[PDB]
Protein backbone atom coordinates (compact mmCIF):
# COMPACT_ATOMS: atom_id res chain seq x y z
CA UNK A 1 0.00 0.00 0.00
CA UNK A 2 2.86 2.35 0.81
CA UNK A 3 4.76 1.19 -2.27
CA UNK A 4 1.69 1.81 -4.44
CA UNK A 5 1.49 5.36 -3.11
CA UNK A 6 5.20 5.81 -3.82
CA UNK A 7 4.85 4.61 -7.41
CA UNK A 8 1.81 6.81 -7.99
CA UNK A 9 3.66 9.83 -6.57
CA UNK A 10 6.74 9.29 -8.74
CA UNK A 11 4.74 8.79 -11.94
CA UNK A 12 2.53 11.79 -11.16
CA UNK A 13 5.58 14.01 -10.59
CA UNK A 14 7.19 12.91 -13.85
CA UNK A 15 3.97 13.41 -15.83
CA UNK A 16 3.46 16.87 -14.33
CA UNK A 17 6.99 17.78 -15.39
CA UNK A 18 6.23 16.64 -18.95
CA UNK A 19 2.98 18.63 -18.95
CA UNK A 20 4.74 21.80 -17.77
CA UNK A 21 7.45 21.24 -20.38
CA UNK A 22 4.85 21.03 -23.14
CA UNK A 23 2.39 23.74 -22.02
CA UNK A 24 4.53 26.54 -20.54
CA UNK A 25 6.75 27.63 -23.47
CA UNK A 26 5.85 29.15 -26.83
CA UNK A 27 5.68 26.61 -29.64
CA UNK A 28 6.42 27.49 -33.24
CA UNK A 29 6.35 24.13 -34.96
CA UNK A 30 6.89 24.05 -38.72
CA UNK A 31 7.80 21.33 -41.21
CA UNK A 32 11.54 22.09 -41.50
CA UNK A 33 11.87 22.16 -37.71
CA UNK A 34 10.20 18.78 -37.11
CA UNK A 35 12.08 16.93 -39.89
CA UNK A 36 14.37 14.05 -38.84
CA UNK A 37 17.95 14.86 -37.89
CA UNK A 38 20.87 13.39 -39.83
CA UNK A 39 23.58 16.08 -39.50
CA UNK A 40 22.09 18.64 -41.91
CA UNK A 41 21.23 16.47 -44.93
CA UNK A 42 17.97 14.65 -45.48
CA UNK A 43 18.00 10.94 -44.58
CA UNK A 44 18.44 8.49 -47.42
CA UNK A 45 16.22 5.61 -46.32
CA UNK A 46 13.92 4.90 -43.42
CA UNK A 47 14.97 4.40 -39.82
CA UNK A 48 12.43 1.55 -39.77
CA UNK A 49 14.57 -0.65 -42.01
CA UNK A 50 16.18 -3.90 -40.78
CA UNK A 51 19.25 -3.17 -38.66
CA UNK A 52 21.51 -6.21 -38.46
CA UNK A 53 22.45 -7.77 -35.12
CA UNK A 54 26.02 -9.06 -35.15
CA UNK A 55 25.82 -10.30 -31.55
CA UNK A 56 22.66 -12.33 -32.18
CA UNK A 57 24.09 -15.57 -30.76
CA UNK A 58 25.24 -13.87 -27.55
CA UNK A 59 21.71 -12.46 -27.22
CA UNK A 60 20.16 -15.93 -27.45
CA UNK A 61 22.80 -17.27 -25.05
CA UNK A 62 22.02 -14.46 -22.60
CA UNK A 63 18.48 -15.85 -22.35
CA UNK A 64 19.71 -19.18 -20.99
CA UNK A 65 22.39 -17.63 -18.78
CA UNK A 66 19.82 -15.23 -17.33
CA UNK A 67 17.63 -18.16 -16.28
CA UNK A 68 20.55 -19.65 -14.36
CA UNK A 69 20.68 -16.66 -12.02
CA UNK A 70 17.09 -17.52 -11.11
CA UNK A 71 18.31 -20.98 -10.09
CA UNK A 72 21.25 -19.57 -8.11
CA UNK A 73 19.39 -16.76 -6.33
CA UNK A 74 17.89 -18.97 -3.57
CA UNK A 75 21.41 -20.09 -2.55
CA UNK A 76 21.53 -17.96 0.65
CA UNK A 77 18.52 -19.84 2.02
CA UNK A 78 19.85 -23.22 0.86
CA UNK A 79 22.92 -22.81 3.08
CA UNK A 80 20.64 -23.18 6.12
CA UNK A 81 19.72 -26.81 5.37
CA UNK A 82 21.03 -29.78 7.33
CA UNK A 83 22.20 -31.61 4.17
CA UNK A 84 25.05 -29.21 3.50
CA UNK A 85 27.04 -31.91 1.69
CA UNK A 86 24.19 -32.53 -0.75
CA UNK A 87 23.48 -28.81 -1.07
CA UNK A 88 27.08 -27.85 -1.81
CA UNK A 89 27.38 -30.62 -4.39
CA UNK A 90 24.30 -29.31 -6.22
CA UNK A 91 25.37 -25.66 -6.06
CA UNK A 92 28.80 -26.48 -7.47
CA UNK A 93 27.27 -28.81 -10.07
CA UNK A 94 25.11 -25.98 -11.41
CA UNK A 95 28.03 -23.54 -11.60
CA UNK A 96 30.34 -26.08 -13.25
CA UNK A 97 27.80 -26.80 -15.99
CA UNK A 98 27.28 -23.06 -16.37
CA UNK A 99 31.02 -22.60 -16.87
CA UNK A 100 31.13 -25.57 -19.24
CA UNK A 101 28.39 -23.91 -21.30
CA UNK A 102 30.55 -20.79 -21.53
CA UNK A 103 33.64 -22.86 -22.38
CA UNK A 104 31.82 -24.61 -25.23
CA UNK A 105 30.53 -21.35 -26.70
CA UNK A 106 33.94 -19.69 -26.33
CA UNK A 107 36.00 -22.49 -27.92
CA UNK A 108 33.54 -23.00 -30.79
CA UNK A 109 33.87 -19.28 -31.72
CA UNK A 110 30.37 -18.44 -30.50
CA UNK A 111 31.34 -15.23 -28.70
CA UNK A 112 32.71 -13.57 -31.85
CA UNK A 113 30.46 -11.07 -33.58
CA UNK A 114 29.54 -11.73 -37.18
CA UNK A 115 31.25 -9.60 -39.80
Amino acid sequence: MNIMLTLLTNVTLASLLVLIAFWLPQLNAYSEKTSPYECGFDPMGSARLPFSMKFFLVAITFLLFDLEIALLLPLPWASQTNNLKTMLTMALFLLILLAASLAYEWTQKGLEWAE
Binding site: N82, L84, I96
Partner: protein
Protein backbone atom coordinates in the same frame (compact mmCIF):
# COMPACT_ATOMS: atom_id res chain seq x y z
CA UNK B 1 56.44 -32.75 -14.92
CA UNK B 2 57.93 -30.55 -17.62
CA UNK B 3 55.10 -30.12 -20.11
CA UNK B 4 52.62 -28.89 -17.50
CA UNK B 5 55.12 -26.34 -16.18
CA UNK B 6 55.60 -24.81 -19.63
CA UNK B 7 51.84 -24.81 -20.21
CA UNK B 8 51.25 -23.06 -16.88
CA UNK B 9 53.95 -20.48 -17.64
CA UNK B 10 52.41 -19.75 -21.03
CA UNK B 11 48.89 -19.50 -19.58
CA UNK B 12 50.05 -17.16 -16.81
CA UNK B 13 51.81 -15.02 -19.43
CA UNK B 14 48.86 -14.82 -21.84
CA UNK B 15 45.63 -15.41 -19.84
CA UNK B 16 46.18 -14.74 -16.13
CA UNK B 17 42.42 -14.26 -15.62
CA UNK B 18 41.69 -17.83 -16.72
CA UNK B 19 44.46 -19.22 -14.50
CA UNK B 20 43.13 -17.30 -11.50
CA UNK B 21 39.54 -18.38 -12.12
CA UNK B 22 40.47 -22.04 -12.63
CA UNK B 23 42.60 -22.04 -9.47
CA UNK B 24 39.85 -20.42 -7.39
CA UNK B 25 37.23 -22.84 -8.71
CA UNK B 26 39.46 -25.83 -8.04
CA UNK B 27 40.12 -24.70 -4.49
CA UNK B 28 36.38 -24.14 -3.99
CA UNK B 29 35.69 -27.69 -5.17
CA UNK B 30 38.45 -29.41 -3.21
CA UNK B 31 38.89 -27.70 0.15
CA UNK B 32 35.42 -28.31 1.71
CA UNK B 33 36.00 -32.08 1.63
CA UNK B 34 39.24 -31.68 3.63
CA UNK B 35 38.01 -29.35 6.37
CA UNK B 36 37.20 -30.22 10.00
CA UNK B 37 34.80 -27.26 10.33
CA UNK B 38 32.40 -28.53 7.64
CA UNK B 39 30.84 -30.85 10.22
CA UNK B 40 30.50 -27.99 12.72
CA UNK B 41 28.47 -25.91 10.26
CA UNK B 42 26.03 -28.80 9.87
CA UNK B 43 25.77 -29.07 13.65
CA UNK B 44 25.10 -25.34 13.87
CA UNK B 45 22.39 -25.64 11.23
CA UNK B 46 20.95 -28.46 13.34
CA UNK B 47 20.94 -26.41 16.55
CA UNK B 48 18.72 -23.62 15.21
CA UNK B 49 15.18 -24.18 16.61
CA UNK B 50 12.91 -22.90 13.86
CA UNK B 51 9.84 -24.76 15.13
CA UNK B 52 8.46 -25.64 18.54
CA UNK B 53 9.92 -28.70 20.32
CA UNK B 54 6.76 -30.69 21.00
CA UNK B 55 7.00 -32.53 24.34
CA UNK B 56 6.85 -36.31 24.56
CA UNK B 57 4.42 -38.22 26.75
CA UNK B 58 6.40 -39.67 29.65
CA UNK B 59 5.83 -43.43 29.45
CA UNK B 60 8.04 -44.06 32.50
CA UNK B 61 11.03 -45.66 30.72
CA UNK B 62 12.53 -42.58 29.03
CA UNK B 63 15.75 -41.89 30.96
CA UNK B 64 17.68 -39.72 28.49
CA UNK B 65 14.71 -37.41 27.84
CA UNK B 66 14.69 -34.40 30.19
CA UNK B 67 11.76 -33.49 32.39
CA UNK B 68 12.74 -29.81 32.56
CA UNK B 69 14.83 -27.70 30.15
CA UNK B 70 17.51 -27.11 32.80
CA UNK B 71 17.91 -30.81 33.60
CA UNK B 72 21.28 -32.27 32.51
CA UNK B 73 19.72 -34.73 30.04
CA UNK B 74 19.38 -33.90 26.36
CA UNK B 75 21.56 -32.21 23.74
CA UNK B 76 24.06 -29.58 24.83
CA UNK B 77 25.21 -26.42 23.05
CA UNK B 78 28.38 -25.92 25.12
CA UNK B 79 30.51 -26.69 22.06
CA UNK B 80 28.92 -23.71 20.31
CA UNK B 81 29.64 -20.92 22.81
CA UNK B 82 33.33 -21.92 22.93
CA UNK B 83 33.48 -21.66 19.13
Amino acid sequence: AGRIASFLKNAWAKEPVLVASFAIGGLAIILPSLSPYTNYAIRINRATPYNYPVPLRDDGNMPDVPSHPQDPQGPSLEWLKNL
